[PDB]
Design a protein around this ligand. Structure first.
Ligand SMILES: CCCCCCCCCCCCCCCCCC(=O)OC[C@H](CO[C@@H]1O[C@H](CO[C@H]2O[C@H](CO)[C@H](O)[C@H](O)[C@H]2O)[C@H](O)[C@H](O)[C@H]1O)OC(=O)CCCCCCCCCCCCCCCCC
Ligand SMILES: CCCCCCCCCCCCCCCCCC(=O)OC[C@H](CO[C@@H]1O[C@H](CO[C@H]2O[C@H](CO)[C@H](O)[C@H](O)[C@H]2O)[C@H](O)[C@H](O)[C@H]1O)OC(=O)CCCCCCCCCCCCCCCCC
Ligand code: CLA
Ligand code: CLA
Ligand code: CLA
Ligand code: CLA
Ligand code: CLA
Ligand code: CLA
Ligand SMILES: CC(C)=CCC/C(C)=C/CC/C(C)=C/CC/C(C)=C/CC/C(C)=C/CC/C(C)=C/CC/C(C)=C/CC/C(C)=C/CC/C(C)=C/CC1=CC(=O)C(C)=C(C)C1=O
Ligand SMILES: CC1=C(/C=C/C(C)=C/C=C/C(C)=C/C=C/C=C(C)/C=C/C=C(C)/C=C/C2=C(C)CCCC2(C)C)C(C)(C)CCC1
Ligand code: OEX
Ligand SMILES: [Fe+2]
Lengths: 34, 37, 334, 59, 30, 157, 93, 52, 137, 35, 245, 58, 136
């Protein structure tokens, strides 16, 4: 009884909300064509 | 809910319609990192 | 040489006193018929069954009214959304009883205003102007079509449409409050911010120009005569008004660019009235504003009142009293 | 087995989206290495058919 | 008798709108 | 104008035509949008109320045809401005409501009084009571009912 | 009417009128709403509680709940504006 | 008869002869200048300034 | 806790159908048992009256009243499709029902087009088709 | 009442046809730039 | 007719046909049975007339001027039931149920709007002989109820069974011993019942179809708004139609 | 500016004369009666149910 | 401040009183708004306003309906207000639960908490429950 749904949702937004700027951050370090 | 072979991924699916809003914000983040040029 | 080319040359001539244009071909016949019927229906028009219950509501000056109470009454509840012209009425007396001239005025109004808007485009094309004054005029056209056209559609009758008058306007606003809760709806909130903000930046821009005028007159004559028409010199020190507002709040909140300044004066109201006129539109289809009634409870479960509960008891007073005879069943579905 | 393969299908699409626009926005990374990446597309498409097979068998 | 005043105020207002549009002081350069 | 942006402003005029029309299908049409799926329409929930209290007071032995309304019109059954027998109230504006649970009670003239006095089927009573309580009247915080309804239901159509 | 006598016998005095009360007034009597109360309201003017037994279509059970409350039922002068809105007078809880 | 499903509100036959003689009476004016022109003359502009 | 909104499963003791629901599943300890005879007797009773509502069809086609034949098969007969689909359990019982429907949809398709024989022909294709349904199961 | 009705469809499609055949009259070329 | 029953609903609506009573064809006799009950009596008036003071050459005797109806197509009565009882000398009719009122409003010369409830409530018809004939002619009294049920609220908010009972925005009228008794008549709302006399006349019968129909003439009294004005005598004429069963 | 007395004296003597203006007074009786019980708890307005102006069937 | 004296509600026709555990009052609200509250919101009945959920109106029914055991009796077998005939065909019930899809999954404790909510709500809000819009 540890509320697996909310733990699942808050991690899965934080995976996806951090997978977007990581596309840009990996390009800024690489100095590619932004 | 989802079929029984897919009840596991019920948290991930709940996030999925939000993701098209995140492409609108991805443009501005990309314009910030390019320096708005 | 041809008769049509000599007519197209006249109707698109900017050398006329008033530019007619191709939109004036259906602006001027529409708005003169909306006008000439409005003046007659406001002055001399018999009472109108609005509730469909054969209780005729007087609205004209000859039947004992004034400027404030007199109004062109909307059409009947018996008609509702049906198109009711003069030729589908079997007499003019049957036409004027059932709310005839409300549909003749409104439908010739919305065609003439949507043609007055396209006429503002057309002359901007023939004068070399950049075109978009008519986009700024879309904001009252959105709001005129919201209370005369869209709200009678979603409510299913022109009788819920706005009465063409002054006291009829406040009958419209209060009944719209009880049935839809417009004040809690965030699109009336986004246009109160549009016209409070609009009247702010109007009187804030108009003061900083008038503050920084250059000496061109004496103290005996008027301030305004230091501007000769068509001159090429700038009539106010814009660096002066920038340094004033740059100290009145702080430095970085001031537009040094006068073009971006004169764009923000056009953005803020017009966006505020586009959003507001799509508040009436989404509340025409009974998607009402917020409802926080009985939202705060104690641990026992008793309802603790809020300001929305006091606002609710004002809405319940108008709801139980609007159209006090037209209802027969416990819920105002219309 | 469907819950194991779809979980393997999501983890690959995590691995692609982090790496594929990085492989394209770089001036040469896609031309220098795409036969590495073209396997991962062919693996990814192959999983969709395996899951569509295992769903029809199980129903 | 009362509404006669209201009508005179309305059409009297539309007169000065007519004169302001057509008999306006036309502005001139130079 | 044969240019790039001009073709884009040709589409945006036509897509707005389709935009209003799909937004007016969803309010009135109960054929492409069945009331069993999308809920009752604006017009349909106004007629389902007047039909429910028609059934309610018919069980009290009341002649509903001759039941004189408070305004002098029909309290239950009145006559449309084209001559048809319709429901009365503020629901007289939606007298064009053609719905699969009321069309069993039609005739040439309209609502057949003989068929109302005798043939009302209990699935129509279960339907008009369902479409009264789930009328398309809501709020942005998704509480149903009228604008002055208390916060207990969670429904916007 | 400004000054109408027998306002009390309509709904609230707990001694009801017959030919003027709403059908909601018979709700306070257990057993009569809706069936037995439906027949009383539907038919025409009554002169007494004895005329309640003259209703066409009464059972012994329908006369039973009238026999219980026959002290509380009483009949008055029918004023014709109250006699119309006896099924529905536009009052809803 | 209002709610009849008739084309353009044409109830009687007489209203057609009104419609046809309205579009055509201005069409014939329009063909007096823009009609009887070359239907085979092109341009690679965005906008044509051909003739009157 | 009393005002916790996103307590999906820690609140209640019984297992729910889904975290996004309030109701428990269709398993044990329910009060609705679909094997009961009064549910079967309700569905059987509408099948019996359907034939009785369908024999009144030619009386309106012998007359001129087409508005009464378009709705007689929707006024009472609305509850048919809910029952005859529910009574159809076995294999060949199921594909017997669409014989009855397609024969019934042509009665309504001919009543709107006002064809007198096509109603009377397809009515007899319906009484014979419900005869096939009721006699088997 | 069917005599008035005839008069309206004259007046509508008179001005609607002036609108329709106004913009077909080479209307983009009527600018202060050229011609 | 049966010709009206041929049509569907979508073909009748918007055409103004449901307002109009049927046309019976042919003439013969039909006999009312012992349990005979009248089924589909519809009444529709085709002309209206209000008794006024008419401007003749030199005289002002009361005459009927006609009037134009302004409520559109809502005047016809329909579905009126009732048993046909057989008295020995004369066949009688007493109506029981059906839509037996249709509120409407006509306009006079001068611009005066006179509403009136057109009704046949509690009708006791009596006609010569027993069987319905083309020479048959029955009529009798009907009771007109008031045009407004007593819970109607006037513009100030005053009704017979609800509302206030004083001029609600004139609070200084109820001062003194006299009170507001000068405007007493506009506070007391009185439900009014008057009488009306209809005279029907059968002239065309089917016996193979058991449906009759002919011309009537009805006179009644217009409304008063619960004692607000003097009501005026309203005459009307038209055609009816009935199914004798 | 509460009332036009020429509108109010006429609507009292003629119980058929209705404008939009007299329609706004009945909307204000609903505001003056329904909210004033909960508006002003210091004054202790205890209204009965039978004095509150309701319309027909609302 | 949900004291156990306030949670103590009457349970049988004789008059015994038992208490409701705090999950009964919480599931009792969620189930009532989801199932019953479409028409019985706040104690009034939308489709028949004469027959409410008032503690006065439940008591005047010909079987007395104030008890928890009397309310769950009504849910499985709804008679009329005078209790002569059944209206299970039109009111949602357990007996006629093939037509209503909303009541195919309800246990005994679920109706015990819904009827708990109908009984314990006049004790919390004395006049708001079934008082109409006057007492909103
Ligand atoms: C200074 C400048 C400001 C002025 C200019 C700007 C004006 C904008 C004003 C912003 C308005 C924001 C208020 C948000 C309030 C909030 O907390 O909102 C609260 C609501 C949630 O309300 C909750 O709603 C609940 C609904 O319950 C329902 O559900 C419950 C279960 O969930 C129960 O079942 C209950 O029975 C049932 O009723 C209850 O009512 C609760 O009391 C209540 O808390 O949020 C909602 O619904 C969220 C969804 C609606 C959001 C809509 C936002 C739209 C904003 C557009 C802005 C346009 C701006 C244009 C600028 C360009
Ligand atoms: C802020 C300050 C101002 C700043 C400027 C404003 C910038 C925009 C801010 C957006 C606010 C969004 C906040 C997110 C929270 C919220 O909203 O959250 C609220 C909901 C999610 O809340 C859920 O909302 C549900 C809504 O009910 C739905 O579910 C219920 C139970 O299923 C019933 O079924 C009901 O019928 C059905 O509507 C219930 O209330 C749930 O309890 C609750 O969890 O978000 C939604 O759905 C999200 C949906 C987003 C897409 C909405 C598009 C809809 C387009 C409608 C346009 C209408 C235009 C007019 C607008 C005025
Ligand atoms: C020219 C401007 C103009 C316009 C647009 C209108 C418009 C209207 N008037 Mg008005 N009127 C005008 C001038 C105008 N009026 C003038 C000058 C007078 C004084 C004489 C009047 C007097 C008047 C009266 C007295 C009344 C109206 C009424 C009306 C309404 C309906 C009339 C009707 O049937 O239209 C006829 C329209 C058509 C036949 C449609 C024409 C549209 C064409 C066909 C374009 C469509 C293109 C097509 C779709 C392309 C198809 C391609 C194909 C391949 C598919 C309508 C809003 C009535 C009203 O509002 O009552 C409520 C009414 O009673 N008018
Ligand atoms: C709301 C009114 C409105 C206004 C002011 C404009 C304004 C403009 N349009 Mg446009 N347009 C509109 C609606 C509107 N549009 C709609 C609704 C459509 C889709 C049918 C189009 C389709 C369209 C095209 C395809 C083109 C324009 C073009 C233009 C420009 C020049 C005017 C012209 O020739 O168009 C003529 C005017 C119209 C086509 C619309 C007339 C709108 C009338 C005056 C009022 C609304 C009535 C309603 C839509 C018609 C219903 C008829 C029915 C009842 C029979 C100008 C910016 C032209 C342009 O410059 O593009 C680069 C162009 O080629 N428009
Ligand atoms: C502090 C108080 C406050 C403020 C500032 C506002 C502000 C506003 N309210 Mg609001 N409101 C309030 C309180 C307030 N409200 C309260 C308390 C209520 C409840 C009673 C409401 C209920 C309410 C309703 C019901 C509505 C508003 C609307 C509006 C908007 C009005 C703007 C408008 O229509 O212009 C837009 C301009 C026009 C409509 C005019 C178009 C005119 C055309 C273009 C030309 C006409 C030409 C003319 C005939 C002749 C010209 C002159 C001639 C001589 C040439 C604005 C955002 C309206 C809204 O939402 O927008 C539609 C609306 O319908 N409010
Ligand atoms: C990899 C190929 C492939 C694909 C695409 C499918 C697809 C499908 N199988 Mg399947 N299957 C596969 C391999 C595949 N299977 C294998 C290898 C086997 C073992 C031999 C099976 C055995 C199998 C069985 C035994 C069953 C299925 C069934 C189904 C269908 C489920 C939908 C349904 O119930 O039918 C109803 C139909 C629909 C719901 C329509 C769904 C399609 C719509 C139109 C969406 C498409 C829209 C569009 C293309 C998307 C936009 C894209 C655009 C941007 C380009 C679905 C169409 C079931 C079936 O067919 O039952 C009828 C079923 O019982 N499968
Ligand atoms: C990042 C920039 C961007 C993006 C995201 C879009 C996005 C879109 N554009 Mg586009 N556009 C852009 C820049 C962009 N545009 C620029 C710079 C121009 C030059 C001025 C155009 C010119 C343009 C035109 C001329 C049109 C679009 C259309 C569209 C829409 C196609 C989908 C659609 O209509 O679905 C809705 C329709 C359906 C679901 C039904 C299927 C119909 C098919 C998909 C229509 C495809 C039309 C096609 C895209 C237009 C041909 C363009 C081609 C000549 C290059 C979509 C919203 C089209 C449109 O209709 O939207 C306005 C259209 O007519 N655009
Ligand atoms: C914010 C973006 C957004 C979103 C989320 C939606 C969402 C939606 N819109 Mg939409 N819309 C939007 C913006 C948006 N709209 C805008 C900006 C416009 C322009 C104003 C419109 C105009 C619009 C219209 C005109 C309509 C919608 C509709 C819809 C709804 C259904 C989607 C649909 O019809 O798919 C459409 C999908 C396609 C066109 C793709 C092709 C689909 C093919 C043809 C289907 C073939 C089916 C076939 C039978 C399958 C058989 C397979 C078998 C043979 C194997 C959906 C709620 C529809 C609706 O329900 O209206 C209420 C509708 O009619 N929208
Ligand atoms: C030591 C001790 C004792 C301990 C206690 C601690 C302690 C000391 C605490 C005290 C600290 C304390 C509170 C001090 C803080 C001071 C403070 C900020 C207090 C004020 C409080 C307060 C709420 C302030 C916030 C409100 C505020 C001023 C908001 C500003 C709003 C704002 C940014 C508006 C901008 C709008 C805008 C864009 C306008 C331009 C558009 C416009 C048309 C302008 C016209 C115009 C502009 C031009 O540009 C030019 C060119 C021209 C031509 C022209 O027309
Ligand atoms: C499908 C899928 C998937 C995928 C997903 C994805 C990949 C998504 C994406 C998404 C994304 C793509 C995201 C994005 C995000 C972003 C963000 C969240 C951002 C935001 C931020 C902010 C908002 C900020 C901004 C700014 C700046 C920077 C500066 C200027 C200003 C501003 C403030 C504007 C997975 C694998 C899961 C699996 C399942 C399915
Ligand atoms: O019309 Mn004018 O107001 Ca809109 O809500 Mn329903 O309808 Mn009637 O009531 Mn309320
Ligand atoms: Fe300026």
């Amino acid at each position: 009884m540890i509320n697996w749904q909310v733990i699942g949702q808050l991690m899965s937004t934080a995976v996806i909300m951090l997978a977007g700027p990581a596309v840009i951050v990996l390009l800024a370090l690489k100095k590619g064509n932004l | 809910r989802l079929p029984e072979a897919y009840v596991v991924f019920s948290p991930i699916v709940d996030v999925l319609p939000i993701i098209p809003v995140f492409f609108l914000l991805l443009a501005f983040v990309w314009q910030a990192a390019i320096g708005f040029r | 040489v041809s008769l049509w080319e000599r007519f197209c040359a006249w109707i698109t001539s900017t050398e006329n006193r008033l530019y007619i244009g191709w939109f004036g071909c259906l602006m001027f016949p529409t708005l003169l018929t909306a006008t000439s019927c409005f003046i007659i229906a406001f002055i001399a028009a018999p009472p109108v069954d609005i509730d469909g219950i054969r209780e005729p509501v007087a609205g004209s000056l000859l039947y004992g009214n004034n400027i404030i109470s007199g109004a062109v009454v909307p059409s009947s509840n018996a008609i509702g959304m049906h198109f009711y012209p003069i030729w589908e009425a079997a007499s003019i007396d049957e036409w004027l009883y059932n709310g005839g001239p409300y549909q003749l005025i409104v439908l010739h109004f919305l065609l003439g205003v949507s043609a007055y808007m396209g006429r503002e485009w057309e002359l901007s094309y023939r004068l070399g102007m950049r075109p978009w004054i008519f986009v700024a005029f879309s904001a009252p056209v959105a709001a005129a079509s919201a209370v005369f056209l869209v709200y009678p559609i979603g409510q299913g009758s022109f009788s819920d449409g706005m009465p063409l008058g002054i006291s009829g306007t406040f009958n419209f606003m209060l009944v719209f409050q009880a049935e839809h809760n417009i004040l809690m709806h965030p699109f009336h909130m986004a246009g109160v911010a549009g016209v409070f903000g609009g009247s702010l930046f109007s009187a804030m821009h108009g003061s900083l120009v008038t503050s920084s005028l250059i000496r061109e007159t004496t103290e005996n004559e008027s301030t305004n005569y230091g501007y000769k028409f068509g001159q090429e010199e700038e009539t106010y020190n814009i660096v002066a008004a920038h340094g004033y507002f740059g100290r009145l709040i702080f430095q970085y909140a001031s537009f040094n660019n006068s073009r971006a300044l004169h764009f923000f004066l056009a953005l803020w109201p017009v966006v505020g009235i586009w959003i507001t006129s799509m508040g009436i539109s989404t509340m025409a289809f009974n998607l009402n504003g917020f409802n926080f009634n009985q939202s705060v409870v104690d641990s026992q479960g008793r309802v603790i009142n809020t300001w929305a509960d006091i606002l609710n008891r004002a809405n319940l007073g108008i709801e139980v009293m609007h159209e006090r005879n037209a209802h027969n069943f416990p819920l105002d579905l219309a | 087995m469907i819950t194991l393969l779809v979980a393997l299908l999501v983890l690959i699409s995590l691995g692609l989206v982090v790496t594929v626009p990085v492989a394209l926005a770089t001036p040469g990374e896609w031309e220098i290495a795409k036969g590495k990446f073209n396997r991962f597309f062919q693996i990814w498409v192959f999983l969709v058919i395996v899951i569509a097979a295992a769903d029809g068998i199980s129903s | 008798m009362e509404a006669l005043v209201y009508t005179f105020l309305l059409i009297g207002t539309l007169m000065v709108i007519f004169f302001a549009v057509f008999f306006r002081e036309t502005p001139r350069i130079l | 104008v044969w240019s790039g942006e001009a073709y884009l402003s040709y589409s945006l005029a036509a897509i707005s035509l389709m935009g209003f029309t799909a937004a007016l299908y969803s309010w009135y049409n109960n054929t492409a949008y069945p009331s069993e799926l999308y809920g009752p329409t604006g017009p349909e929930a106004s007629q389902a109320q007047a039909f429910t209290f028609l059934v309610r007071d018919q069980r009290l032995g009341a002649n509903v045809s001759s039941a004189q309304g408070p305004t002098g019109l029909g309290k239950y059954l009145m006559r449309s401005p084209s001559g048809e027998i319709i429901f009365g109230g503020e629901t007289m504006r939606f007298w064009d409501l053609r719905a699969p649970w009321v069309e069993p009670l039609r005739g040439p003239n309209g609502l057949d009084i003989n068929k109302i006095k005798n043939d009302i089927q209990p699935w129509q009573e279960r339907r008009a009571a369902e479409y009264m309580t789930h009328a398309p009247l809501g709020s942005l915080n998704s509480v149903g009912g009228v604008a002055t309804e208390i916060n207990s239901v969670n429904y916007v159509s | 009417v400004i000054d109408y006598e027998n306002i009390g016998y309509l709904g609230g005095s707990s001694i009801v009128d017959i030919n003027n009360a709403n059908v909601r007034a018979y709700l306070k009597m257990p057993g009569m709403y809706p069936t037995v109360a439906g027949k009383i309201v539907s038919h025409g003017p009554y002169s007494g509680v004895a005329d309640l037994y003259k209703i066409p279509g009464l059972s012994s059970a329908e006369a039973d709940v009238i026999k219980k409350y026959e002290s509380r039922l009483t009949a008055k002068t029918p004023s014709p504006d109250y006699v119309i809105d006896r099924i529905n007078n536009g009052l809803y809880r | 008869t209002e709610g009849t499903n008739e084309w353009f509100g044409v109830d009687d036959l007489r209203l057609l002869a009104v419609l046809f003689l309205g579009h055509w009476a201005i069409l014939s004016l329009w063909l007096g200048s823009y009609g009887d022109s070359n239907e085979d003359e092109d341009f690679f502009g965005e906008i044509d300034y051909s003739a009157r | 806790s009393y005002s916790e909104g996103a307590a999906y499963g820690t609140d209640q003791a019984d297992k729910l159908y889904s975290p996004y629901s309030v109701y428990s599943p269709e398993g044990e300890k329910s009060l609705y048992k679909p094997d009961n005879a009064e549910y079967l007797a309700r569905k059987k009773a509408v099948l019996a009256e359907t034939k009785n509502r369908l024999q009144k069809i030619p009386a309106y086609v012998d007359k001129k009243e087409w508005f009464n034949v378009k709705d007689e098969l929707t006024r009472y007969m609305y509850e048919t499709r809910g029952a005859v689909r529910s009574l159809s359990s076995s294999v060949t019982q199921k594909e017997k029902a669409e014989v009855f429907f397609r024969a019934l949809e042509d009665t309504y398709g001919a009543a709107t087009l006002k064809k007198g024989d096509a109603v009377k022909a397809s009515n007899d294709k319906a009484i014979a088709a419900l005869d096939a349904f009721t006699a088997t199961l | 009442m069917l005599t008035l009705k005839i008069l309206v469809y004259t007046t509508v499609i008179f001005f609607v046809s002036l609108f329709i055949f106004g913009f077909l009259s080479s209307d983009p070329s009527r600018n202060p730039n050229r011609k | 007719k049966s010709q009206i029953n041929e049509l569907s609903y979508l073909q009748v609506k918007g055409t103004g046909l449901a307002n109009r009573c049927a046309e019976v064809v042919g003439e013969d006799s039909i006999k009312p049975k012992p349990g005979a009950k009248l089924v589909d009596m519809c009444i529709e008036p085709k002309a209206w007339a209000v008794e006024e003071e008419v401007g003749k050459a030199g005289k002002t005797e009361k005459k009927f001027v006609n009037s134009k109806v302004m409520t559109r197509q809502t005047y016809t009565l329909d579905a009126i039931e009732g048993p046909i009882t057989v008295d020995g000398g004369k066949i009688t009719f007493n109506e029981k149920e059906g839509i037996d009122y249709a509120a409407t409003t006509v306009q006079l010369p001068g611009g005066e709007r006179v509403p009136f409830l057109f009704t046949v409530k509690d009708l006791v018809a009596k006609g010569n002989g027993d069987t319905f004939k083309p020479g048959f002619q029955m009529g009798g009294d009907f009771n007109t109820p008031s045009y407004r049920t007593g819970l109607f609220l006037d513009p100030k908010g005053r009704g017979g069974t609800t509302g206030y009972d004083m001029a609600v925005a004139l609070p200084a009228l109820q001062l003194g011993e006299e009170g507001d008794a000068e405007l007493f008549g506009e506070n007391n709302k009185v439900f009014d019942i008057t009488q009306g006399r209809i005279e029907m006349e059968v002239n065309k019968v089917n016996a193979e179809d058991s449906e009759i129909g002919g011309v009537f003439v009805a006179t009644q009294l217009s409304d008063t708004d619960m004692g607000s004005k003097t009501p005026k005598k309203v005459l009307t004429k038209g055609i009816f139609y009935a199914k004798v069963d | 500016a509460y009332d036009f007395v020429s509108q109010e004296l006429r609507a009292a003597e003629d119980p058929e004369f209705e404008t939009f203006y007299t329609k706004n007074h009945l909307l204000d009786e609903g505001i003056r009666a329904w909210m004033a019980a909960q508006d002003q708890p210091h004054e202790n307005f205890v209204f009965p149910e039978e004095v509150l102006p309701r319309g027909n069937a609302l | 401040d949900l004291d156990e004296a306030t949670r103590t509600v009457v349970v049988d026709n004789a008059g015994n009183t038992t208490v409701l555990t705090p999950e009964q009052v919480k599931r009792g609200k969620r189930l009532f708004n989801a199932t019953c509250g479409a028409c019985h919101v706040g104690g009034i009945t939308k489709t028949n306003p004469n027959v409410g959920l008032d503690p006065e109106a439940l008591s005047l029914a010909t079987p007395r309906r104030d008890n928890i055991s009397a309310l769950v009796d009504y849910i499985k077998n709804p008679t009329t207000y005078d209790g002569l005939e059944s209206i299970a065909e039109v009111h949602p019930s357990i007996k006629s639960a093939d037509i209503y899809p909303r009541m195919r999954s309800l246990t005994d404790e679920d109706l015990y908490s819904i009827a708990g909510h109908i009984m314990l709500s006049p004790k919390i809000a004395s006049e708001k429950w079934g008082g109409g819009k006057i007492y909103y």
